[PDB]
């Protein structure tokens, strides 16, 4: 029940997920309500649901940050449920990741976390990863400790702390600065065509080895240099999880 397919998002906002209006009435939630998303390995994420005129009725549109927090990939299926009793917290402790803060020093709160958190009313859960951009760097943070649990909303009077050594990245957690589909601008028609050819045999290998229909085995991309031929190949491997070998 309430199991929808994970799709690509247009709104890059890390606290926003898009669902089509008819699903707001099936889930009995109002525009802007706070919901939980159920992912893999007994993990979940909290976000705000907004409506638009582009989301498919049976899909949920979420960005890379939310998918990584749920440990899911495009094409998977996750559960959505409302949580109307969410409240805001008073204390949130956030630390940077060791693999993203390098060569740069200063007051991380004033530069990154303050404009991200202050008066944004973002839902935040313990263990969430999120990305704050600025100063020509892309710095990701992890939430380690909060007073309320397991999640809360950031209030204008919520105090953000940041003390301690940078967090060592987990071996099963991919960096948010890796190449994905949201790094590709034009040539969307070609990216969609390729995804149809490759994502199915790569994500569902049990389908092809069990049927008489053979998969595509070789795809030749052509065009002038500097048009994203390698960028697509990397985005596909990183988004599906296939092992990428460069020649």
């Amino acid at each position: 029940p309430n199991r929808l397919i994970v799709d690509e998002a247009i709104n890059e906002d890390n606290s926003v997920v898009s669902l089509s209006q008819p699903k707001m009435d099936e889930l009995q939630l109002f525009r802007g309500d706070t919901v939980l998303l159920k992912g893999k390995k007994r993990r979940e994420a909290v976000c705000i649901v907004l409506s638009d005129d582009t989301c498919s009725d049976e899909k949920i549109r979420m960005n890379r940050v939310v998918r990584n927090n749920l440990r899911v990939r495009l094409g998977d299926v996750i559960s959505i449920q409302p949580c109307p009793d969410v409240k805001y917290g008073k204390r949130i402790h956030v630390l940077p990741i060791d693999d993203t803060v390098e060569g740069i020093t200063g007051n991380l709160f004033e530069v990154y976390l303050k404009p991200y958190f202050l008066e944004a009313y973002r839902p935040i859960r313990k263990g969430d990863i999120f990305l704050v951009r600025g100063g020509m760097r892309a710095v990701e943070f992890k939430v380690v400790e909060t007073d309320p649990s397991p999640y809360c909303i950031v209030a204008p009077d919520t105090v953000i702390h940041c003390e301690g050594e940078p967090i060592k990245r987990e071996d099963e957690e991919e960096s948010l600065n890796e190449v994905g589909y949201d790094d590709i601008g034009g040539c969307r028609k070609q990216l969609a065509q390729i995804k149809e050819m490759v994502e199915l045999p790569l994500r569902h290998p049990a389908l092809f080895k069990a049927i008489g229909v053979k998969p595509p085995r070789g795809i030749l991309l052509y065009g002038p240099p500097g048009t994203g031929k390698t960028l697509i190949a990397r985005a596909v491997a990183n988004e599906t999880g296939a092992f990428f070998f460069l020649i």
Binding site: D13, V16, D33, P84, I153
Partner: peptide, 20 residues
């Protein structure tokens, strides 16, 4: 509840700023 309604106004305002 009301804390969710405050987050609703903030999320809707950022979406409109990005769409415009």
């Amino acid at each position: 509840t009301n804390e969710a309604q405050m987050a609703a106004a903030a999320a809707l305002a950022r979406l409109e700023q990005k769409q415009s």
